[PDB]
Curated annotation (Swiss-Prot):
Keywords: Endoplasmic reticulum, Heme, Iron, Membrane, Metal-binding, Microsome, Monooxygenase, Oxidoreductase, Phosphoprotein. It is a peripheral membrane protein. This is Cytochrome P450 2B4. One of its GO terms (molecular function) is oxidoreductase activity, acting on paired donors, with incorporation or reduction of molecular oxygen, reduced flavin or flavoprotein as one donor, and incorporation of one atom of oxygen. Disulfide bonds: none annotated. Changing residue 409 to S: Conversion into an NADPH oxidase with negligible monooxygenase activity. Its EC number is 1.14.14.1.
Length: 465
């Protein structure tokens, strides 16, 4: 049986000595050199199994997507989730919420259409709020978080917030700031010595007080939604959850109990707002480094969508180039370097090693988007990776930014749609430009932990006439 190869760990400390100074990801890469694609590492006491390569990630999450369908714990945030919510819940509790939220939000907009029209709309706004900026050097960080947040809030909270609404701007600002702490160094030195450090002050405390405020807003908005619930017509995700939360109060095992409502509404409100938004942020920072790549996208929009009607989702097909630039933005982006933690649900048999039940598994996704076996020139923005000789969209076994298996990003649908509608609708109406010389544009992440934060930058949105 035995666990995969890795360095011999010391008591308490685990393989802390073999760890690279830069952080976790870098470390897993420096060990893959000595052991290869699949190997074992001990983060302090807890042994994890790292997975590198496009192959290893699928042989596990795709070909045995049941023994790996288990969610692990993320150091700094377990305190607030304690295993609840739809993202961190396990076993039956997981399927319980997963299916519910996947179904609730779906037949409430998501799925397709109702949301598409919602996005073209939110985008329409993002376009007039940008005209207002009269193309003055701004910081799209906040604004971006807004447009992707509204899309999700309309599904969960049902309502939509104004771009300059103080409350709204605080949750957003809170999400951003928090993701940045969740991906900092402590958020990692914690993963290791969480039990050790938690007794002393640090950023781990700040991540708590942060999610707190949000949980409040979530919570105090559950009350508002409470006294206004017209069972004959639910308004959003909260109502539906409320209708079934009240319904099953005779089954003291129904995972539908506040704890979840808040933590699930937080999982969908944080992710739904966070990633899609910083992907575009990274996207555009990449559109300044390569202005010649923008001209094309703005031309492909011109041939297809023309320029007298907002981009529709259908257009993603007739626009194979822009599709590839996005897959490439997403690929180089790599917002989630080593995917949210996993765990085998049973004694699993993998490649010749026997991973005991409940053993944490990290699917280094970064080493799948950057894999040389599937991506020629993986470290170079190359819309080619996703195209054939006849210049058409081509699939690629290495493109797994949302991940794979039963734990695959619940919101892959929305996201891919939001990206294509916002991204083109903007480039359709505006033409980015920034004071920094393209060769000087740096894409190195500002923070790289469980998440990759693109450095902050200024960009002006010159209107196109
Ligand atoms: C730029 C877009 C996005 C990217 C790159 C992304 C990334 C991912 C990744 C890498 C995971 C972990 C998969 C795993 O367990 O191995 C995940 C999970 C998750 N994401 Fe996203 N995500 C995106 C947007 C969204 C959106 C728009 C929502 C909200 C509707 C969302 C909600 C979720 C949820 C609920 C999970 C947990 C799923 C589960 O436990 O089964 N994400 N996503
Ligand atoms: Cl702790 C954590 C992990 C993943 C996500 N996420 C973001 C987008 N999809 C998943 C949010 C929070």
């Amino acid at each position: 049986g035995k666990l995969p190869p890795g360095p011999s760990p010391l008591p308490v400390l685990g393989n802390l000595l073999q760890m690279d100074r830069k952080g976790l990801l870098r470390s897993f890469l420096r060990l893959r050199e000595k052991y290869g694609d699949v190997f074992t590492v001990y983060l302090g006491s807890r042994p994890v199994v790292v997975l590198c390569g496009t192959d290893a990630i699928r042989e596990a999450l795709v070909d045995q997507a049941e023994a790996f369908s288990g969610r692990g714990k993320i150091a700094v945030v377990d305190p607030i989730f304690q295993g609840y919510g739809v993202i961190f819940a396990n076993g039956e509790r997981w399927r319980a919420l997963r299916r519910f939220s996947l179904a609730t939000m779906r037949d409430f907009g998501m799925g397709k259409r109702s949301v598409e029209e919602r996005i073209q709309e939110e985008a329409r706004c993002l376009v007039e709020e940008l005209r207002k900026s009269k193309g003055a050097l701004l910081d799209n960080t906040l604004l971006f978080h807004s447009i992707t947040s509204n899309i999700i809030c309309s599904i969960v909270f049902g309502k939509r917030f104004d771009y300059k609404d103080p409350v709204f701007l605080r949750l957003l600002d809170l999400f951003f700031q928090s993701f940045s702490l969740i991906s900092s160094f402590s958020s990692q030195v914690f993963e290791l010595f969480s039990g050790f450090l938690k007794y002393f002050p640090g950023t781990h405390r700040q991540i708590y007080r942060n999610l707190q405020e949000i949980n409040t807003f979530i919570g105090q908005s559950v009350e508002k939604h409470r006294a206004t619930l017209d069972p004959s017509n639910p308004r959003d995700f909260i109502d539906v959850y409320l209708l079934r939360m009240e319904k099953d109060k005779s089954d003291p095992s129904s995972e539908f109990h506040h704890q979840n409502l808040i933590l699930t509404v937080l999982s969908l409100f944080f992710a739904g707002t966070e990633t899609t938004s910083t992907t575009l942020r990274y996207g555009f920072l990449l559109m300044l480094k390569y202005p010649h790549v923008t001209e094309r996208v703005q031309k492909e929009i011109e041939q297809v969508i023309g320029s007298h009607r907002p981009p529709a989702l259908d257009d993603r097909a007739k626009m194979p180039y822009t599709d590839a630039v996005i897959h490439e933005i997403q690929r180089l982006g790599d917002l989630i370097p080593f995917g949210v933690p996993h765990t085998v649900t049973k004694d699993t048999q993998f490649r010749g090693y026997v991973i005991p039940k409940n053993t944490e598994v990290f699917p280094v996704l970064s080493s799948a988007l950057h894999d040389p076996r599937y991506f020629e020139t993986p470290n170079t923005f190359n819309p080619g990776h996703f195209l054939d000789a006849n210049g058409a969209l081509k699939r690629n076994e290495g493109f797994m930014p949302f991940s794979l298996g039963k734990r695959i990003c619940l919101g892959e649908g929305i996201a891919r749609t939001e990206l294509f509608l916002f991204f083109t609708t903007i480039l359709q109406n505006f033409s980015i430009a920034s004071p920094v010389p393209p060769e000087d544009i740096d894409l190195t992440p500002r923070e790289s932990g469980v998440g990759n934060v693109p450095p902050s930058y200024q960009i002006r949105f010159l209107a196109r006439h």
